[PDB]
């Protein structure tokens, strides 16, 4: 019973791991990073 409820706890925990969502980066993040990534990258971004 207690072992079974701990099994249920582990299942709930791994489920909660699955549902976790880390926010993807936005707009100016990508803009400034690509405009500071590489010389070809900075030129392409300053063009874009």
């Amino acid at each position: 019973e207690s072992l079974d409820r701990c099994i249920d706890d582990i299942n709930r925990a791994v489920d909660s791991m699955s549902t976790l969502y880390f926010k993807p980066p936005g707009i100016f993040h990508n803009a400034i990073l690509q405009g500071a990534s590489n010389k070809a990258s900075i030129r392409k971004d300053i063009t874009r």
Binding site: G35, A36, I42, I46
Partner: protein, 64 residues
């Protein structure tokens, strides 16, 4: 001495003393205004903001 000119000169003296007091006040206000302009407008706000702007300009010009 003409009494009319006497009263005219007395009025002139009173008005000039009033002028002197007003000019003293003007001098104080202009000193305060100069302090606010030179030390703050350009001395602190202008210098710091210009420094930031030129630094950013140099950074992003070298990153052309």
């Amino acid at each position: 001495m003409n009494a009319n000119k006497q009263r005219q000169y007395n009025q002139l003296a009173h008005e000039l003393r009033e002028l002197q007091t007003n000019l003293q006040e003007t001098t104080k206000q202009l000193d305060i205004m100069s302090k606010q302009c030179n030390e703050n407008l350009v001395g602190q706000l202008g210098k710091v903001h210009g420094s930031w702007l030129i630094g950013s300009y140099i950074y992003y010009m070298e990153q052309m």
